[PDB]
PDB file of C-alpha atoms and ligand atoms in Angstrom:
ATOM      1  CA  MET A 962       0.000   0.000   0.000  1.00 33.35           C
ATOM      2  CA  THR A 963       1.014   3.614  -0.551  1.00 31.71           C
ATOM      3  CA  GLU A 964       2.574   5.553   2.308  1.00 29.66           C
ATOM      4  CA  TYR A 965       2.275   9.337   2.667  1.00 31.45           C
ATOM      5  CA  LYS A 966       4.560  11.206   5.063  1.00 32.77           C
ATOM      6  CA  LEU A 967       2.756  14.305   6.341  1.00 34.88           C
ATOM      7  CA  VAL A 968       4.179  16.967   8.660  1.00 33.69           C
ATOM      8  CA  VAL A 969       2.117  19.435  10.710  1.00 33.69           C
ATOM      9  CA  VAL A 970       3.824  22.794  11.378  1.00 35.73           C
ATOM     10  CA  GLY A 971       2.902  26.183  12.791  1.00 35.51           C
ATOM     11  CA  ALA A 972       3.177  28.390  15.838  1.00 35.77           C
ATOM     12  CA  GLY A 973       2.755  27.265  19.404  1.00 32.33           C
ATOM     13  CA  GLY A 974      -0.788  26.749  20.575  1.00 31.64           C
ATOM     14  CA  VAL A 975      -2.570  26.866  17.206  1.00 32.77           C
ATOM     15  CA  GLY A 976      -3.915  23.312  17.509  1.00 34.26           C
ATOM     16  CA  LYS A 977      -1.523  21.075  15.559  1.00 36.83           C
ATOM     17  CA  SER A 978      -1.763  18.272  18.090  1.00 36.40           C
ATOM     18  CA  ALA A 979      -5.504  18.581  18.586  1.00 31.96           C
ATOM     19  CA  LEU A 980      -6.027  18.376  14.819  1.00 31.85           C
ATOM     20  CA  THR A 981      -3.817  15.304  14.506  1.00 31.94           C
ATOM     21  CA  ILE A 982      -5.358  13.543  17.491  1.00 29.90           C
ATOM     22  CA  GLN A 983      -8.867  14.217  16.172  1.00 25.93           C
ATOM     23  CA  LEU A 984      -7.943  12.637  12.866  1.00 25.22           C
ATOM     24  CA  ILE A 985      -6.195   9.604  14.359  1.00 26.06           C
ATOM     25  CA  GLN A 986      -8.049   9.004  17.637  1.00 25.00           C
ATOM     26  CA  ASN A 987     -11.428  10.718  17.243  1.00 24.65           C
ATOM     27  CA  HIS A 988     -11.427  12.835  20.372  1.00 21.29           C
ATOM     28  CA  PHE A 989     -10.645  16.429  21.306  1.00 22.31           C
ATOM     29  CA  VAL A 990      -7.681  17.246  23.541  1.00 25.25           C
ATOM     30  CA  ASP A 991      -8.883  20.103  25.770  1.00 25.53           C
ATOM     31  CA  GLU A 992      -5.632  20.591  27.718  1.00 24.40           C
ATOM     32  CA  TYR A 993      -2.453  22.177  26.385  1.00 22.96           C
ATOM     33  CA  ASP A 994       0.668  20.025  26.700  1.00 22.12           C
ATOM     34  CA  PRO A 995       3.393  21.438  24.402  1.00 23.23           C
ATOM     35  CA  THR A 996       4.781  18.973  21.864  1.00 22.05           C
ATOM     36  CA  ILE A 997       8.404  18.113  21.192  1.00 22.89           C
ATOM     37  CA  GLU A 998       8.056  15.694  18.262  1.00 24.69           C
ATOM     38  CA  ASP A 999       5.418  12.932  18.069  1.00 25.37           C
ATOM     39  CA  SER A1000       4.559  10.504  15.267  1.00 28.05           C
ATOM     40  CA  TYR A1001       1.250   8.813  14.427  1.00 29.34           C
ATOM     41  CA  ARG A1002       0.310   6.198  11.849  1.00 28.35           C
ATOM     42  CA  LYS A1003      -3.057   5.206  10.468  1.00 28.97           C
ATOM     43  CA  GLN A1004      -4.309   3.127   7.563  1.00 28.48           C
ATOM     44  CA  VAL A1005      -7.186   4.789   5.703  1.00 28.80           C
ATOM     45  CA  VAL A1006      -8.919   4.546   2.334  1.00 28.17           C
ATOM     46  CA  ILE A1007      -8.790   7.795   0.354  1.00 30.15           C
ATOM     47  CA  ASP A1008     -10.464   7.900  -3.071  1.00 31.66           C
ATOM     48  CA  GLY A1009     -10.473   4.119  -3.291  1.00 29.37           C
ATOM     49  CA  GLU A1010      -6.761   3.789  -2.433  1.00 30.18           C
ATOM     50  CA  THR A1011      -5.682   2.055   0.769  1.00 32.47           C
ATOM     51  CA  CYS A1012      -3.072   4.441   2.241  1.00 31.79           C
ATOM     52  CA  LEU A1013      -0.782   4.530   5.266  1.00 29.72           C
ATOM     53  CA  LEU A1014      -0.586   8.030   6.709  1.00 30.03           C
ATOM     54  CA  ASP A1015       2.572   8.710   8.740  1.00 25.64           C
ATOM     55  CA  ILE A1016       2.022  12.041  10.510  1.00 26.79           C
ATOM     56  CA  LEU A1017       4.717  14.009  12.278  1.00 28.52           C
ATOM     57  CA  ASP A1018       3.371  16.438  14.877  1.00 25.08           C
ATOM     58  CA  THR A1019       6.009  19.092  15.512  1.00 23.81           C
ATOM     59  CA  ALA A1020       6.782  21.699  18.137  1.00 24.87           C
ATOM     60  CA  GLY A1021       5.577  25.238  17.693  1.00 28.12           C
ATOM     61  CA  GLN A1022       7.473  26.549  20.699  1.00 27.98           C
ATOM     62  CA  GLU A1023      10.537  28.220  19.164  1.00 29.07           C
ATOM     63  CA  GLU A1024      12.921  26.496  21.596  1.00 27.75           C
ATOM     64  CA  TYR A1025      12.842  23.414  19.312  1.00 28.69           C
ATOM     65  CA  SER A1026      13.242  25.233  15.981  1.00 28.90           C
ATOM     66  CA  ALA A1027      16.681  23.684  15.364  1.00 28.32           C
ATOM     67  CA  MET A1028      15.686  20.059  16.025  1.00 26.86           C
ATOM     68  CA  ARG A1029      12.699  20.484  13.702  1.00 26.80           C
ATOM     69  CA  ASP A1030      14.863  20.815  10.568  1.00 24.24           C
ATOM     70  CA  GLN A1031      16.014  17.195  10.587  1.00 24.58           C
ATOM     71  CA  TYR A1032      12.576  15.731  11.303  1.00 26.66           C
ATOM     72  CA  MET A1033      10.935  17.818   8.571  1.00 25.54           C
ATOM     73  CA  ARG A1034      13.419  16.713   5.856  1.00 27.56           C
ATOM     74  CA  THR A1035      11.609  13.436   5.228  1.00 29.26           C
ATOM     75  CA  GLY A1036       8.154  15.002   4.887  1.00 30.09           C
ATOM     76  CA  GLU A1037       6.325  14.700   1.578  1.00 29.74           C
ATOM     77  CA  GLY A1038       3.639  17.257   2.353  1.00 29.16           C
ATOM     78  CA  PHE A1039       3.056  19.878   4.995  1.00 28.41           C
ATOM     79  CA  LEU A1040       0.010  21.159   6.835  1.00 28.81           C
ATOM     80  CA  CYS A1041       0.795  24.781   7.750  1.00 28.87           C
ATOM     81  CA  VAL A1042      -1.514  25.753  10.594  1.00 27.20           C
ATOM     82  CA  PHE A1043      -2.443  29.096  12.134  1.00 24.99           C
ATOM     83  CA  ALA A1044      -5.354  30.017  14.414  1.00 22.04           C
ATOM     84  CA  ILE A1045      -8.033  32.429  13.187  1.00 21.13           C
ATOM     85  CA  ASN A1046      -8.040  34.150  16.625  1.00 18.87           C
ATOM     86  CA  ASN A1047      -4.250  34.717  16.699  1.00 21.97           C
ATOM     87  CA  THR A1048      -2.983  37.312  14.230  1.00 23.08           C
ATOM     88  CA  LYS A1049       0.667  36.674  15.061  1.00 24.08           C
ATOM     89  CA  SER A1050       0.297  32.978  14.174  1.00 22.39           C
ATOM     90  CA  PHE A1051      -0.881  34.033  10.708  1.00 23.02           C
ATOM     91  CA  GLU A1052       1.953  36.544  10.334  1.00 24.49           C
ATOM     92  CA  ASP A1053       4.378  33.735  11.308  1.00 26.50           C
ATOM     93  CA  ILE A1054       3.307  31.410   8.458  1.00 28.92           C
ATOM     94  CA  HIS A1055       5.840  32.877   6.038  1.00 32.09           C
ATOM     95  CA  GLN A1056       8.659  31.658   8.289  1.00 33.74           C
ATOM     96  CA  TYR A1057       7.442  28.042   8.307  1.00 34.27           C
ATOM     97  CA  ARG A1058       7.153  28.180   4.521  1.00 33.71           C
ATOM     98  CA  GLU A1059      10.784  29.349   4.358  1.00 34.29           C
ATOM     99  CA  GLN A1060      11.925  26.565   6.713  1.00 33.06           C
ATOM    100  CA  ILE A1061      10.188  24.011   4.471  1.00 35.72           C
ATOM    101  CA  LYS A1062      11.880  25.390   1.358  1.00 36.10           C
ATOM    102  CA  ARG A1063      15.248  25.159   3.144  1.00 35.09           C
ATOM    103  CA  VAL A1064      14.920  21.553   4.363  1.00 34.84           C
ATOM    104  CA  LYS A1065      13.432  20.272   1.094  1.00 38.65           C
ATOM    105  CA  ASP A1066      15.591  22.492  -1.159  1.00 36.96           C
ATOM    106  CA  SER A1067      12.613  23.033  -3.457  1.00 35.00           C
ATOM    107  CA  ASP A1068      10.059  25.750  -4.257  1.00 36.47           C
ATOM    108  CA  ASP A1069       7.299  23.280  -5.201  1.00 36.33           C
ATOM    109  CA  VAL A1070       6.450  21.314  -2.044  1.00 35.11           C
ATOM    110  CA  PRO A1071       2.906  20.021  -1.442  1.00 34.65           C
ATOM    111  CA  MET A1072       1.285  22.108   1.259  1.00 33.66           C
ATOM    112  CA  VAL A1073      -2.135  23.164   2.577  1.00 32.77           C
ATOM    113  CA  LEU A1074      -2.820  26.316   4.625  1.00 31.53           C
ATOM    114  CA  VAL A1075      -5.101  25.581   7.599  1.00 32.44           C
ATOM    115  CA  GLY A1076      -6.940  28.201   9.648  1.00 31.81           C
ATOM    116  CA  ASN A1077      -7.797  26.304  12.829  1.00 33.01           C
ATOM    117  CA  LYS A1078     -10.051  27.207  15.779  1.00 33.10           C
ATOM    118  CA  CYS A1079     -12.842  28.315  13.445  1.00 31.09           C
ATOM    119  CA  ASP A1080     -15.289  27.681  16.297  1.00 31.00           C
ATOM    120  CA  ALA A1081     -13.695  30.593  18.194  1.00 27.68           C
ATOM    121  CA  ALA A1082     -15.746  33.732  18.725  1.00 27.86           C
ATOM    122  CA  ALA A1083     -12.904  36.309  18.464  1.00 29.07           C
ATOM    123  CA  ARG A1084     -11.776  36.072  14.861  1.00 28.65           C
ATOM    124  CA  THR A1085      -8.959  38.414  13.845  1.00 30.12           C
ATOM    125  CA  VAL A1086      -7.919  36.687  10.579  1.00 30.13           C
ATOM    126  CA  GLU A1087     -10.655  36.912   7.975  1.00 31.01           C
ATOM    127  CA  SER A1088     -11.112  34.099   5.488  1.00 32.63           C
ATOM    128  CA  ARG A1089     -10.338  36.437   2.580  1.00 32.35           C
ATOM    129  CA  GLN A1090      -6.960  37.396   4.078  1.00 34.05           C
ATOM    130  CA  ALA A1091      -5.946  33.741   4.346  1.00 34.06           C
ATOM    131  CA  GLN A1092      -7.289  32.940   0.870  1.00 36.07           C
ATOM    132  CA  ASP A1093      -5.049  35.694  -0.504  1.00 33.10           C
ATOM    133  CA  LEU A1094      -1.980  34.250   1.229  1.00 34.79           C
ATOM    134  CA  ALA A1095      -2.788  30.745  -0.024  1.00 35.24           C
ATOM    135  CA  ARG A1096      -3.311  32.099  -3.555  1.00 36.65           C
ATOM    136  CA  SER A1097       0.240  33.735  -3.377  1.00 35.66           C
ATOM    137  CA  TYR A1098       1.680  30.312  -2.549  1.00 36.86           C
ATOM    138  CA  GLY A1099      -0.442  28.349  -5.027  1.00 41.60           C
ATOM    139  CA  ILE A1100      -2.030  26.136  -2.362  1.00 36.91           C
ATOM    140  CA  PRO A1101      -5.481  25.499  -0.901  1.00 36.52           C
ATOM    141  CA  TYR A1102      -6.855  27.169   2.218  1.00 36.10           C
ATOM    142  CA  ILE A1103      -9.151  25.166   4.515  1.00 39.43           C
ATOM    143  CA  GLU A1104     -10.682  26.212   7.833  1.00 37.62           C
ATOM    144  CA  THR A1105     -10.900  23.670  10.633  1.00 35.94           C
ATOM    145  CA  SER A1106     -12.002  23.181  14.200  1.00 33.86           C
ATOM    146  CA  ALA A1107     -10.352  20.377  16.135  1.00 33.35           C
ATOM    147  CA  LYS A1108     -13.062  20.962  18.771  1.00 32.24           C
ATOM    148  CA  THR A1109     -16.081  20.318  16.514  1.00 33.46           C
ATOM    149  CA  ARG A1110     -14.138  18.186  13.987  1.00 34.98           C
ATOM    150  CA  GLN A1111     -15.174  20.522  11.139  1.00 31.44           C
ATOM    151  CA  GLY A1112     -12.782  20.319   8.205  1.00 32.36           C
ATOM    152  CA  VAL A1113     -10.335  17.982   9.926  1.00 31.45           C
ATOM    153  CA  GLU A1114     -10.526  15.114   7.434  1.00 30.16           C
ATOM    154  CA  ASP A1115     -10.809  17.571   4.570  1.00 29.88           C
ATOM    155  CA  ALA A1116      -7.535  19.278   5.530  1.00 30.18           C
ATOM    156  CA  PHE A1117      -5.512  16.057   5.760  1.00 24.29           C
ATOM    157  CA  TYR A1118      -7.120  14.362   2.743  1.00 23.88           C
ATOM    158  CA  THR A1119      -6.652  17.496   0.616  1.00 27.28           C
ATOM    159  CA  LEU A1120      -2.953  17.368   1.491  1.00 27.45           C
ATOM    160  CA  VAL A1121      -2.827  13.770   0.215  1.00 30.15           C
ATOM    161  CA  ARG A1122      -4.581  14.877  -2.990  1.00 32.03           C
ATOM    162  CA  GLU A1123      -1.962  17.625  -3.384  1.00 34.01           C
ATOM    163  CA  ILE A1124       0.894  15.129  -2.992  1.00 33.40           C
ATOM    164  CA  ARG A1125      -0.764  13.076  -5.783  1.00 33.62           C
ATOM    165  CA  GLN A1126      -0.697  16.002  -8.214  1.00 32.75           C
ATOM    166  CA  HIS A1127       3.073  16.304  -7.767  1.00 36.16           C
TER     167      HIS A1127
HETATM  168  N1  GNP B1355     -11.627  26.152  20.682  1.00 36.15           N
HETATM  169  C1  GNP B1355     -10.633  25.442  20.106  1.00 36.15           C
HETATM  170  N2  GNP B1355      -9.580  25.134  20.843  1.00 36.15           N
HETATM  171  C2  GNP B1355      -8.608  24.426  20.248  1.00 36.15           C
HETATM  172  C3  GNP B1355      -8.699  23.987  18.870  1.00 36.15           C
HETATM  173  N3  GNP B1355      -7.568  23.303  18.581  1.00 36.15           N
HETATM  174  C4  GNP B1355      -6.803  23.321  19.683  1.00 36.15           C
HETATM  175  N4  GNP B1355      -7.453  23.977  20.674  1.00 36.15           N
HETATM  176  C5  GNP B1355      -6.952  24.184  22.027  1.00 36.15           C
HETATM  177  O1  GNP B1355      -5.780  24.952  21.971  1.00 36.15           O
HETATM  178  C6  GNP B1355      -4.820  24.506  22.932  1.00 36.15           C
HETATM  179  C7  GNP B1355      -3.541  24.121  22.222  1.00 36.15           C
HETATM  180  O2  GNP B1355      -3.765  23.050  21.289  1.00 36.15           O
HETATM  181  P1  GNP B1355      -2.600  22.079  20.844  1.00 36.15           P
HETATM  182  O3  GNP B1355      -3.198  21.203  19.825  1.00 36.15           O
HETATM  183  O4  GNP B1355      -1.878  21.563  22.076  1.00 36.15           O
HETATM  184  O5  GNP B1355      -1.609  23.158  20.123  1.00 36.15           O
HETATM  185  P2  GNP B1355      -0.248  22.886  19.385  1.00 36.15           P
HETATM  186  O6  GNP B1355      -0.228  23.683  18.126  1.00 36.15           O
HETATM  187  O7  GNP B1355      -0.057  21.374  19.200  1.00 36.15           O
HETATM  188  N5  GNP B1355       0.881  23.509  20.493  1.00 36.15           N
HETATM  189  P3  GNP B1355       2.538  23.110  20.467  1.00 36.15           P
HETATM  190  O8  GNP B1355       3.139  23.716  19.191  1.00 36.15           O
HETATM  191  O9  GNP B1355       3.114  23.725  21.736  1.00 36.15           O
HETATM  192  O10 GNP B1355       2.682  21.556  20.526  1.00 36.15           O
HETATM  193  C8  GNP B1355      -5.465  23.336  23.646  1.00 36.15           C
HETATM  194  O11 GNP B1355      -6.014  23.846  24.869  1.00 36.15           O
HETATM  195  C9  GNP B1355      -6.554  22.879  22.712  1.00 36.15           C
HETATM  196  O12 GNP B1355      -7.687  22.334  23.355  1.00 36.15           O
HETATM  197  C10 GNP B1355      -9.887  24.337  18.142  1.00 36.15           C
HETATM  198  O13 GNP B1355     -10.083  24.038  16.941  1.00 36.15           O
HETATM  199  N6  GNP B1355     -10.787  25.052  18.833  1.00 36.15           N
HETATM  200 CA1   CA B1356     -11.117  15.772  25.775  1.00 32.97          CA
HETATM  201 CA1   CA B1357       1.369  20.154  19.952  1.00 31.66          CA
HETATM  202 MG1   MG B1358      -8.022  43.116  10.464  1.00 31.29          MG
END
């Protein structure tokens, strides 16, 4: 069966782990335990193909920025996550997209932009602003909530579909 190596990146606290755990384990993690580097595996059927997803959940706390480079090198596609109630996390995306281009040494890496926490009441990043950033990179934008599970499968499965176009 086909294996896809996916990496989830973005600032601290935006919900990378909650998104991943919703996908893999079908529950919402309410507490905040910062991640170092965790890996998950799951067999799924996507568009009639039996796939193995190997997901690397990375640290957003900038103390681990150096260790991240070597883990990210093996990734085939990246989920770049910000939170729609955290303007700085959106402004930080550009940096993660530069780190990816450095570790992969390529300008054409499969990637999806994810605006998480779309259940939150205090939105400061409008959908149009994120669509414009995604358009500049040539990638899809999807909004998610790890809390309600909205968009979670869509975000990960769209990333697989992007890997398949490359
Ligand atoms: N309301 C809401 N809260 C969320 C959502 N996703 C994550 N959270 C909450 O935000 C906090 C941080 O989530 P977490 O997934 O640990 O963030 P992270 O990006 O993995 N942090 P780190 O980079 O430090 O590992 C948790 O309290 C979690 O419940 C969401 O979609 N909606
Ligand atoms: Ca819970
Ligand atoms: Ca985490
Ligand atoms: Mg504004």
